[PDB]
Design a protein around this ligand. Structure first.
Ligand SMILES: NC(=O)c1ccc[n+]([C@@H]2O[C@H](COP(=O)([O-])OP(=O)(O)OC[C@H]3O[C@@H](n4cnc5c(N)ncnc54)[C@H](O)[C@@H]3O)[C@@H](O)[C@H]2O)c1
Ligand SMILES: NC(=O)c1ccc[n+]([C@@H]2O[C@H](COP(=O)([O-])OP(=O)(O)OC[C@H]3O[C@@H](n4cnc5c(N)ncnc54)[C@H](O)[C@@H]3O)[C@@H](O)[C@H]2O)c1
Ligand SMILES: NC(=O)c1ccc[n+]([C@@H]2O[C@H](COP(=O)([O-])OP(=O)(O)OC[C@H]3O[C@@H](n4cnc5c(N)ncnc54)[C@H](O)[C@@H]3O)[C@@H](O)[C@H]2O)c1
Ligand SMILES: NC(=O)c1ccc[n+]([C@@H]2O[C@H](COP(=O)([O-])OP(=O)(O)OC[C@H]3O[C@@H](n4cnc5c(N)ncnc54)[C@H](O)[C@@H]3O)[C@@H](O)[C@H]2O)c1
Ligand SMILES: O=C1O[C@@](c2ccsc2)(c2cccc(Nc3ccc(F)cc3)c2)CC(O)=C1Sc1ccccc1Cl
Ligand SMILES: O=C1O[C@@](c2ccsc2)(c2cccc(Nc3ccc(F)cc3)c2)CC(O)=C1Sc1ccccc1Cl
Ligand SMILES: O=C1O[C@@](c2ccsc2)(c2cccc(Nc3ccc(F)cc3)c2)CC(O)=C1Sc1ccccc1Cl
Ligand SMILES: O=C1O[C@@](c2ccsc2)(c2cccc(Nc3ccc(F)cc3)c2)CC(O)=C1Sc1ccccc1Cl
Lengths: 331, 331, 331, 331
């Protein structure tokens, strides 16, 4: 007999389908940061990685596998073929090269819609009941694209949206007040990135509205310029790219937080991109961030935030812009 | 009054010392994986990052700070100046560029000795009571260098040594047996990397010695080629470099495990590099991996492993080689 | 030589002063639930237990020590003598038998002031720089007693106060809305227990004020009876005592959450009992719950919550009642 | 319209089922310590509690529910009816009053067999695919009883067995050597409690056999009395009962560790009670502890420990005694 058979007596071989499997598509800076965060939070019993660069993909898989002794995820797999992703509860899309210098949004949309045409049918083929979590940019457009190609119901297509924007805002608010970000509440909604909307009415510490205490909050005439907090969210994003060339840790940590609510059915509220048709005068098939309840069926509910006329106008303008790009797309 | 003063009443403004501070020196692939693993394990109340590339350093600091909402480390600081590292309990050295394309594994000696000449006195200036954890290669030589320059007692200079080698070995053992690496015990000692020693006598599952069950274990006569498990440790290290260009995740996870035992005073046993003079016929000031008890004073004790004649001869050969290089170094 | 000396070579026998020590005084239902919660959250490197019943104390210590394999707190000590508590960062008081049936508040305070007269000087003698966290009831009165006897500055004397009341409120709110309590914000302030104040203005989900949406919120004329969410906090407390005889798990978990902010210097905001003199027209030396910023120096700051005239009147009435009892105390 | 419908827009109201449910049967000292440990380890998405004392059951459920804000288990349910336990992955039996002073092993068996006659069919009815984890005493006899009544394959019927005995042994070993119990390996096998077997050959630190270093280990020729390390396991168990009246924390922590390997499919090796028929000359349907690989299918494999003739004779004697009691049982 072999050493294995001499040491171990087998009662059964009968392997089951993975019970809490997560797949990450695209093992770049963002994808690997999502992967390490997910592993360190014990969210999955199986992690699958997919990319088109075979050597980098294998090397990343091996490097994570070599840390198994310090993890509680007994199976890490990878491949260019989507058969490695079979029976995933959650599939995270972080694919396509990051935006290049001088590269426009329309050019990013062009190439990423193209790869989604291959990615999404392959994901759906092997995990037809998965929740799709889109991170790739422009995240609001690509969440619509994933929804359209997949044919999945609204609840199972989630865009990262304004989750990173709100996390950055809460960090900046915390720094300003000398309070941990967990205790500094504030929501950044609408279109992810440059055109996002800070909801000044909800900015609070311990339920004490900062807008009620300081009526000039968020206005350009504010003597203390609290609008700086939202402006620094956009500025810090560009600054990080200027200084290191990409963002990985902050987006990876924010994605693992969404994955935790989904995998553990927590029903916590997060700012994520969802189908907002029928809200704020929006009539088009567009995905924008609102506070969503996240659980085992993805987005089961959304919070109906009271917005000012200015805030509503900004979301409607974003919806018009996004729909303008979307109507010209070919699926 | 400002909005901050309107919202918050201050009881005292007494600036106090960090209680569980960790510094990481060199924010490359290894340093940042050490950082994210330490942050995700809640080991520090303050993290300080140091490097010579100012833009990359600032970008890395900001990226980690932007994930604060999902962490429990309230302060992340960085700087080229070592004043940012003041009062660290643990200082991790992951500095110096990794081994370049046509560079000798040894070419790191001269250039890393030169950078350590400036790093170590600066670390000692601001944290004279810290534990020093050396990761930079050749890790055994550089741990000796850190010890010599710092003037610290033996217990406060720890080399990552064979911690990654043993973690890889236990992953490979686990794969062969169908058992989690946590339950697959085995020790790889001596010189980190190519010249490491697998201690076949200690390889076990549930206290059942694999060598007792299979006497050919670790021999060239073994029809099952169990010796290939240690050889695959060395081969997988080269394979990861070939596939992705560097190793980050596995070393980061292993370093956070050592940091946990130190910060929490666990007194767990780890294979790390320590001053081995007085053991295995070694008379020179050389650092090699043996199982060490790690706690709040660093290495308080070491395990005296019974080695075979061939194992002892390999450690003594490594000591002769390391000392040969070390005696020619100028301080 | 002994087996220990044959197996292990000692580098240094020097033991450092405790670095992250917590003491729990009174190992009853509350004390032990605080103890298990602190241990499972890896908050301390040393846990000390104190009581007057020597056998129960030793049994509780041993029972925790027997679970050491599954914990990361390497030292668990106990004793009737407070020398075991030396150099604690945090001392938690859960001493005195729980309130008996037919026993009045005045009876409860008299008893507990009599034991605090011995406890507090003993705690101060061995840990003069500790933070004191009072749990024993009436918690607001006993926090004042601990502050008076200790002579500590007000930032280092923290009462559990309305932390459990707010946790219960958020659980009930979450059940009604179908949202996790983490995403259901609401503050219960003032006097702990029967006379606590729900601050309806701060009750929100994702920054959306429930009071703004539903102006009858918290009024008796409310068709949806949202006021019952606070009334059920008080009813649920009496119900738990009626059904099992005491509360342990919920208070244990809430105390560990306060211990986490203190030990890790998080600066999160919690509803805890602090010296309220100078706020809400209160002129007496009374401790009431307001949102406090908790860190390594205890309460460094407090949030100035805007209260309605009714809310302010209730806190002032509680201050008058508490002071009325406090002025007659003899210690 | 309601406040809930004003605040939250529902996307779907699909009444879904838990993916990772655990049930605890018997909410006594052991049962509730298992529950709190399981909750603090984030192992379940739903926890069900069952008992026959309805008030105590409801009070325990409520007390856990009130701590929801500090947990990540969104649903805690209870009931006398087993419909609350439907589709549990793991069912833990901690039912039947603890053995009383002057109560014989036979009397404890008889009353617990009677209670299992009702419990086990009820558990099987609602969770036919669950893993059964028996804690109630005499644990080896009651694991056999559960297996007989359930009709489950032997991989899905696990007895707590020598898991607590080995945890206590490793604690005592760690105390003597000044090493954390995680780094002190040693296995206590066979019959749980008084008649358990310490496997001296497997006792090691870092793969260094204590028996090889100290040949008198486990004998009376031992001037250091290492045999007491096993004897003190039995003595400390009686001592804890003498001092506090029961054991809860250590058994609770040990059970949560088994639950973690099962729920997360870790395939770690644990000393648990399994059907040992066909091993060590044993021919009867008896359950004894050996090192078992634990995962999503329960016990998939067992480690074949090489025992000395004396060790083998002690296990066969335990099997004869257990079978002697079992053959007279009425189902
Ligand atoms: N939503 C947010 O808040 C947010 C924040 C930061 C970054 N991002 C986005 O995340 C995306 C990734 O960023 P990055 O820095 O990791 O880029 P990257 O260039 O480092 O990595 C991209 C990876 O995708 C892979 N890839 C390319 N085509 C593929 C395909 N057809 N199938 C599978 N994999 C493929 C690449 O090989 C590469 O490994 C970008 O779109 C970026 O804008 C989003
Ligand atoms: N001990 C082990 O098991 C193990 C395993 C893997 C890698 N390593 C070692 O870790 C080291 C780092 O590897 P890497 O891949 O992260 O290299 P890297 O090139 O990615 O990063 C090196 C960093 O050090 C910085 N640096 C250079 N000089 C400095 C100075 N004087 N002060 C502070 N910082 C300075 C660089 O700017 C750079 O950011 C290497 O020596 C490598 O061999 C050790
Ligand atoms: N602040 C809150 O929200 C909150 C919630 C629940 C309970 N509590 C309070 O916690 C306290 C303890 O409750 P319990 O149910 O654990 O009581 P308990 O009767 O179970 O235990 C009390 C313990 O205190 C010990 N003790 C008595 N005198 C002592 C002394 N001089 N020194 C040290 N220890 C001594 C007892 O021996 C006993 O072990 C009560 O006052 C109770 O009201 C507070
Ligand atoms: N395997 C081990 O290592 C180990 C260690 C310690 C204790 N134990 C055992 O755990 C068991 C429980 O101990 P305890 O101290 O918690 O006892 P306990 O008296 O505190 O609690 C027993 C509980 O079981 C309930 N119960 C009784 N009949 C029931 C039924 N038909 N259905 C459901 N629930 C029922 C009781 O109402 C009670 O709540 C004992 O058998 C004890 O010996 C085992
Ligand atoms: O933080 C990021 O990194 C990216 C970024 C940053 C500024 S605009 C987009 C990112 C990530 C990686 C690469 C690039 N390349 C890039 C950036 C700007 C250019 F003008 C051209 C190319 C960009 C991608 C992205 O969406 C974010 S989050 C973000 C971006 C803008 C404002 C607010 C937020 Cl919260
Ligand atoms: O796993 C690694 O990555 C490095 C490595 C890998 C193989 S030799 C050294 C590493 C890290 C980063 C860069 C490079 N560059 C490199 C490597 C080999 C060459 F021949 C030339 C250049 C190397 C550095 C290192 O020490 C390790 S751990 C390791 C190395 C060899 C055998 C066993 C182990 Cl456990
Ligand atoms: O939840 C508890 O348990 C206690 C309690 C519960 C209702 S009044 C006091 C508690 C704990 C232990 C024992 C007793 N004994 C008792 C209870 C009621 C009586 F009328 C007489 C004696 C009481 C002690 C206490 O402070 C709390 S928390 C609490 C209490 C009232 C309202 C709201 C909350 Cl959040
Ligand atoms: O640690 C325990 O507590 C119990 C125990 C302790 C000593 S014998 C049984 C236990 C738990 C709760 C109550 C009682 N009551 C009891 C105790 C002794 C008697 F003689 C009669 C009744 C017993 C139940 C039990 O199995 C254990 S573990 C254990 C028991 C004996 C030897 C070694 C171990 Cl590791």
């Amino acid at each position: 007999a072999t050493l294995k058979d001499q040491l171990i007596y087998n009662l059964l071989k009968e392997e089951q389908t993975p019970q809490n499997k997560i797949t990450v598509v695209g093992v770049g800076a963002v994808g690997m940061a999502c992967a390490i965060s997910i592993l360190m939070k014990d969210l999955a019993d199986e992690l699958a990685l997919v990319d088109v660069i075979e050597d980098k993909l294998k090397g990343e898989m091996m490097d994570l596998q070599h840390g198994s002794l310090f993890l509680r995820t007994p199976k890490i797999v990878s491949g260019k073929d989507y058969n490695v992703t079979a029976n995933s509860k959650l599939v995270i899309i972080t694919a396509g090269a990051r935006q290049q210098e001088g590269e426009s949004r329309l050019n990013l949309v062009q190439r990423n819609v193209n790869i989604f045409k291959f990615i999404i049918p392959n994901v759906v083929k092997y995990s037809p009941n998965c929740k799709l979590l889109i991170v790739s940019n422009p995240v609001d457009i690509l969440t619509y694209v994933a929804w359209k190609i997949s044919g999945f119901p609204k609840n199972r297509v989630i865009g990262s949206g304004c989750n990173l924007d709100s996390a950055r805002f809460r960090y900046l608010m915390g720094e300003r007040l000398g309070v941990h970000p967990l205790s500094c509440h504030g929501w950044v909604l609408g279109e992810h990135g440059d055109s996002s909307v800070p909801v000044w009415s909800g900015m609070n510490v311990a339920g004490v509205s900062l807008k009620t205490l300081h009526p000039d909050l968020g206005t350009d005439k504010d003597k203390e310029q609290w609008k700086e907090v939202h402006k620094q969210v956009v500025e810090s994003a560009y600054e990080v790219i200027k200084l290191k060339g990409y963002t990985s840790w902050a987006i990876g940590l924010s994605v693992a937080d969404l994955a935790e609510s989904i995998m553990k059915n927590l029903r916590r509220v997060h700012p994520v991109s969802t189908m907002i048709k029928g809200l704020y005068g929006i009539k088009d098939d567009v995905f924008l961030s609102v506070p969503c309840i996240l659980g085992q069926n993805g987005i089961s509910d959304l919070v109906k935030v009271t917005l000012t006329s200015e805030e509503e106008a900004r979301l409607k303008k974003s919806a018009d812009t996004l729909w303008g790009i979307q109507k010209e797309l070919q699926f």
